[PDB]
């Protein structure tokens, strides 16, 4: 929190953990609706949290709604989190560097718009005016001799 919000951060009590569990449950609902085409009613009490630390850090895992022995595999939770990460960030005002899901990395940042490597056309027009000046000058020189 200190990194992102600077001298404006909220303190992290247990209501923030409640909101975090709710966000993850929503993220799971959406994934199971838009991909598996099912409709499962995850709640904030199907997100189990462990090892809460002060440096802000913990483990969690998601189980089926009422079948406590049933655990959603890690891969599908990662998939479901990639899909809605930009929303969980916004819920807490974090920016994907102050909220790390260890093992999940964002990789959509590709910049590219050189049409022709436009430096070359400027070099070319300058070389052209150079050679035209050169030819005009050798013209005027050899002629008037």
């Amino acid at each position: 929190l200190k990194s992102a919000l600077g001298d404006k951060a909220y303190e992290w009590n247990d209501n923030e953990m409640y909101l975090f569990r709710s966000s993850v449950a929503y993220a799971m609902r959406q994934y199971f609706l838009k991909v598996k085409n099912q409709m499962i009613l995850f709640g904030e009490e199907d997100v189990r949290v462990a090892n809460l630390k002060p440096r802000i850090s913990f483990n969690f895992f998601v189980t089926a709604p009422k079948n406590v022995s049933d655990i959603i595999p890690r891969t599908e939770v990662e998939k479901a989190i990639r899909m809605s990460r930009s929303r969980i960030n916004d819920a807490f005002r974090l920016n994907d560097n102050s909220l790390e899901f260890l093992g999940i990395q964002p990789t959509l940042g590709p910049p590219n718009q050189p049409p022709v490597s436009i430096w070359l056309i400027v070099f070319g027009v300058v070389m052209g005016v150079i050679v035209v000046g050169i030819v005009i000058l050798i013209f005027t020189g050899i002629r008037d001799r």
Binding site: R55, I56, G109, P111, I118, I134, L137
Partner: protein
């Protein structure tokens, strides 16, 4: 009529003053190199220029013609002075080439050196661009693509080749359209550099941690003042920045200056040279201290993050000061985890980093491009600064080319077949075709090989020959009387002693101590880029290295005894 002083500054300002001086200053601690500069300037900078301008007004003849009329022993100093500037021009033009390149690469958003590339995984930046900064990578890879060793000659690269071609072409155009470029325009070309330097000083002085740069540049650290290498290097930087030895100045006051005073003029020009050097070397070092302190804070924050991540600690707990305290408190905490990570703890300090952060012959480029990305608008300041630098370069370039176009055209045997445009084209042609070598992959190695030695040794020999000749072959009292007759003034004993007394002794003592400390250590190690790590390691020279410097220094200053021998044989028939 202020035009005379601005013309004088035009004569004065070159590129060994704005580009070579900062690099050479940084190379030897700065503060422990600045004071030697002032020393050698006060003690042999002024009087040698006085003597040269005086004899130039006296003889009113060409470089070779003057020393021909002075004495028979003095036939080869002119041709040596010519070949020196001839060799200079080649490796001098690639700087204008690079300025052109950086200018062409600035019509964009964002600037190419401002952002690092991506890896194949598209997850993080290219680590090659992270070891080095966002600029150093662009310098050693994009525009240079240098090889980590000298043994890798490699094939010719073509983008800098093409840019150097355009540079030579515009040189040819500027020379072909008359032997003048000043007159009612001197104000503009003389005020542009100072103006942009003031703007960049204002910029680089409102940058955090800038005080460290000036503090480091000014403090004298008395451990390398006892190294004569800094001494000879400063002496040479002064000699090369003042255009002496090249013969352009002995030829400038030949068809000019009927009976005006040379003392005042030379004093103004030397003072202005020194002021330009010392001023232009303050903005760069303010910005360089900024870069150093930024790199230091980044190292500190990275290690603090690693610490707060590995064990566990509230974020924002290890900021800048309590670290050491924490570093202690985590030793008794659980050393079974602390010792097992200790070899990863980075150990970085401010002065050790500030010592070597951007050092190298491309210093000015890497620091200025780093300062331009920090501006508000980028393309504007970029093209402005690079246009300034390119204009200064081309001015110094045409100034150098005059001193070689003139003394080859006056001889009536060579200028019987072809006019001046033809031979000018031929010389530009051979100059480009030989300077192509620096375009090679390991070309910067050849560049740093050429620069220091070809600018130092030959010039240092020619100047001492000139002084000892003019003093103890013509007679001091004779020239004193000649000046008293031509101008109606009596020289002070100030110059009477300094023309043969001190400088002839000091320069050769320094040369002997330089050549003596050369054998106290052995051979030399130059530099290397180590792309895998991103710093400047100190690889050793190859075999043919010593041989090529030997032929350089020989071909550059083994021509005076050859004229002494030619005089011997031409007196026997």
């Amino acid at each position: 009529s202020l035009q005379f002083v601005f013309a004088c500054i035009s004569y004065a300002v070159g590129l060994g003053n704005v580009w070579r001086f900062p690099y050479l200053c940084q190379m030897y601690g700065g503060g422990s190199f600045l004071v030697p500069y002032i020393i050698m300037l006060i003690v042999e900078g002024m009087p040698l220029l006085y003597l040269e301008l005086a004899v130039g007004q006296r003889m009113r003849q060409g470089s070779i013609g003057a020393w021909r009329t002075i004495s028979p022993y003095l036939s080869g100093v002119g041709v040596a002075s010519v070949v020196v500037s001839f060799f200079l021009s080649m490796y001098y033009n690639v700087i204008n080439a690079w300025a052109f390149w950086y200018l062409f690469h600035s019509f964009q958003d964002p600037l190419p050196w401002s952002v690092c590339p991506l890896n194949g995984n598209h997850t993080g930046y290219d680590e090659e661009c992270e070891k080095a900064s966002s600029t150093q990578y662009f310098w050693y890879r994009k525009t240079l693509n240098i090889s980590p060793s000298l043994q890798e000659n490699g094939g010719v690269q073509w983008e800098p080749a093409l840019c150097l071609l355009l540079a030579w072409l515009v040189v040819y155009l500027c020379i072909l359209r008359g032997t003048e470029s000043t007159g009612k325009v001197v104000y503009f070309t003389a005020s542009l550099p100072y103006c942009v330097l003031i703007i960049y000083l204002i910029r680089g002085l409102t940058l955090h941690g800038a005080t460290n740069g000036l503090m480091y540049m000014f403090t004298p650290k008395i451990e390398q003042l006892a190294n004569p290498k800094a001494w000879i290097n400063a002496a040479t930087q002064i000699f090369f920045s003042l255009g002496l030895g090249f013969g352009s100045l002995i030829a400038f006051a030949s068809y000019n200056e009927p009976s005006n005073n040379c003392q005042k003029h030379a004093i103004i020009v030397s003072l202005i040279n020194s002021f330009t050097s010392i001023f232009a070397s303050i903005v760069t070092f303010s910005i360089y201290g900024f870069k150093a302190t930024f790199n230091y804070e980044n190292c500190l924050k990275k290690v603090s993050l690693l610490l707060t991540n590995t064990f566990d600690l509230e974020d924002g707990f290890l900021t800048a000061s309590n670290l050491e305290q924490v570093k202690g408190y985590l030793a008794s905490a659980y050393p079974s985890k602390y010792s097992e990570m200790f070899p990863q703890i980075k150990n970085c300090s401010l002065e050790s980093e500030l010592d070597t952060a951007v050092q190298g012959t491309g210093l000015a480029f890497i620091v200025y491009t780093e300062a331009i990305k920090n501006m508000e608008v980028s393309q504007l300041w970029s093209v402005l600064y690079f246009f300034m630098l390119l204009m200064l370069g081309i001015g110094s370039m045409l100034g150098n080319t005059a001193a070689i176009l003139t003394p080859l055209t006056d001889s009536k045997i060579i200028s019987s077949h072809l006019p001046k445009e033809a031979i000018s084209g031929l010389v530009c042609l051979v100059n480009c075709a030989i300077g192509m070598v620096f375009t090679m992959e390991a070309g910067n190695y050849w560049f740093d090989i050429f620069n220091d030695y070809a600018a130092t040794l030959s010039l240092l020999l020619i100047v001492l020959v000139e002084t000892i000749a003019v003093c103890y072959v013509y007679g001091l009292r004779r020239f004193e009387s000649d000046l008293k007759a031509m101008t109606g003034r009596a020289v002070s004993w100030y110059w009477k002693v300094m023309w043969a007394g001190v400088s002839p002794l000091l320069i050769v003592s320094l040369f002997v101590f330089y050549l003596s400390d050369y054998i106290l250590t052995g051979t030399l190690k130059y530099q290397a880029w180590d792309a895998s790590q991103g710093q400047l390691v100190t690889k050793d020279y190859p075999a043919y290295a010593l041989a090529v410097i030997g032929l350089l220094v020989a071909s550059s200053t083994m021509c005076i005894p050859l004229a002494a021998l030619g005089t011997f044989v031409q007196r026997r028939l």
